[PDB]
Amino acid sequence: MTKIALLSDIHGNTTALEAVLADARQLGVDEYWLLGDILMPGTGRRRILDLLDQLPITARVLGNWEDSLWHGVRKELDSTRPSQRYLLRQCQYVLEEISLEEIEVLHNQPLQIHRQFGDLTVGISHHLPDKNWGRELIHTGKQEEFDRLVTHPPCDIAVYGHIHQQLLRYGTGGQLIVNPGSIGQPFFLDAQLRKDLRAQYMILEFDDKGLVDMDFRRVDYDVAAELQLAKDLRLPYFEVYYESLVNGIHHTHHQEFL
Amino acid sequence: MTKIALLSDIHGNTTALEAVLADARQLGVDEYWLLGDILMPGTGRRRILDLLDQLPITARVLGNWEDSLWHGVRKELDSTRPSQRYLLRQCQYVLEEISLEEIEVLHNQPLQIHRQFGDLTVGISHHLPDKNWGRELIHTGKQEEFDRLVTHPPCDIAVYGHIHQQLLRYGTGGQLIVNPGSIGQPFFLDAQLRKDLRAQYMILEFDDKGLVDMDFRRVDYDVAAELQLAKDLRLPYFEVYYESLVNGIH
Ligand SMILES: [Fe+3]
Ligand SMILES: [Fe+3]
Ligand SMILES: [Mn+2]
Ligand SMILES: [Mn+2]
């Protein structure tokens, strides 16, 4: 069998990623799939690329924040929107440690990929197969949008990230649709669930008979340490970051994730 | 931390249920939640009840197949309707081992209950809070209907069974909605997923911080042995049971 960790929406959250990788290592994970949104608005730059480099990452797709980073260091962002001025500052922060060539590598990733496990075809994308941004696939998204994940082209299981919520539901034709949630910026609309902001990821396990396990995991990490790191590093918008990690609130005029 | 196994839609599948329970034991499960649809149209009768009796069952709700059994043994079914003829024959098979008193106990179970883990409230029902049958919460179900699980009364996480598919989705207000799928009659609309008819169930784990794990599991079981059991015990509609366990068509 093959045990796969889905890593999504790290968003530069160094301590959360380190904790998730420690959890996956102890589970004997065989490979990693990277669903995108790797850097920003969190602390990690070189550290995150270094940590990912040590992994057997066998599948990687492009997140909207990779496009944002690329346009951001090319000064191609719309200055008139408050969220884009926030983003510009996060891009400058990243550029301090990450080279333009490395950002080119981040940008040059496919939107959608496919992998085969026996009888099963798995589709993989950050959001929609042809569109890594937007609100189409949120918790209340239209069924016809979900169906885009698993038809034209077809697959039996689709995995996506982007919305920062864990998920297991279906295409109209019964195809599985799963989401690991977010390692670094987990999102909850429910106030009681929002009290627990541990990292989200998931494990897929395939064997000779098919998909044997879908484990939606939560991983504790030292939030105090991540926040102290953000101070020490002069991370822009410390209070926005604090809010995201401690109270789980995100903002249209800051992150504008969706 | 507390580790809870959710058991649903056993539908008399003795061998599947034994394999799931062995899996849960090996995982060190602390308690079991039983979501209903215990007997029929599978092999198991006394053995299923004995298996369940050994379990620390901390939550239990009424499935529609419990009502169907109760109605069946009350001589209310009309065999001129094919679905009722089928059901009546399954009830006859159950009655060979299971007493009316035991059926009473199966039938006397609440439709919806709630359980508390620190800050989190969990709602539990077979299908809808006040309706354990129907198609409201199928995979393409209306959001309005899903929201019924987590509002009036409220909960933060709702668990249900009945549709025989594993699920993790949300109420409009972000409340979790989960489904372990079916132990004895796993259901797939997708023809490729249907090539794997291992038992379905799930584990929830709660700790001091909240909900730490939702593990949607598949458990291998000896289908041949279950079908051989069906032959030896003279189970009605063998060909229908065969198709359900081998090909997954209903
Ligand atoms: Fe993201
Ligand atoms: Fe059922
Ligand atoms: Mn995204
Ligand atoms: Mn049912």
PDB file of C-alpha atoms and ligand atoms in Angstrom, chain B residues 8-11 36-38 40 64-65 126 161-164 182 185, ligand 2:
ATOM      1  CA  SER B   8     -24.232   2.163  11.037  1.00  0.00           C
ATOM      2  CA  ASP B   9     -26.274   0.164   8.552  1.00  0.00           C
ATOM      3  CA  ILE B  10     -24.997  -3.283   9.538  1.00  0.00           C
ATOM      4  CA  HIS B  11     -28.039  -4.753   7.738  1.00  0.00           C
ATOM      5  CA  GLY B  36     -29.384   1.936  13.401  1.00  0.00           C
ATOM      6  CA  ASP B  37     -30.338  -0.515  10.576  1.00  0.00           C
ATOM      7  CA  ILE B  38     -29.051  -3.494  12.526  1.00  0.00           C
ATOM      8  CA  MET B  40     -31.886  -7.559   7.496  1.00  0.00           C
ATOM      9  CA  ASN B  64     -35.908   2.750   9.571  1.00  0.00           C
ATOM     10  CA  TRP B  65     -35.153  -0.977   9.217  1.00  0.00           C
ATOM     11  CA  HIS B 126     -30.148   7.710  11.640  1.00  0.00           C
ATOM     12  CA  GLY B 161     -26.241   7.105   8.663  1.00  0.00           C
ATOM     13  CA  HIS B 162     -28.950   5.733   6.341  1.00  0.00           C
ATOM     14  CA  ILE B 163     -27.464   6.705   2.914  1.00  0.00           C
ATOM     15  CA  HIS B 164     -24.573   4.146   3.154  1.00  0.00           C
ATOM     16  CA  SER B 182     -22.494   1.338   5.970  1.00  0.00           C
ATOM     17  CA  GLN B 185     -24.165  -2.649   2.458  1.00  0.00           C
TER      18      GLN B 185
HETATM   19 FE    FE C   2     -29.472   1.296   5.965  1.00  0.00          FE
END
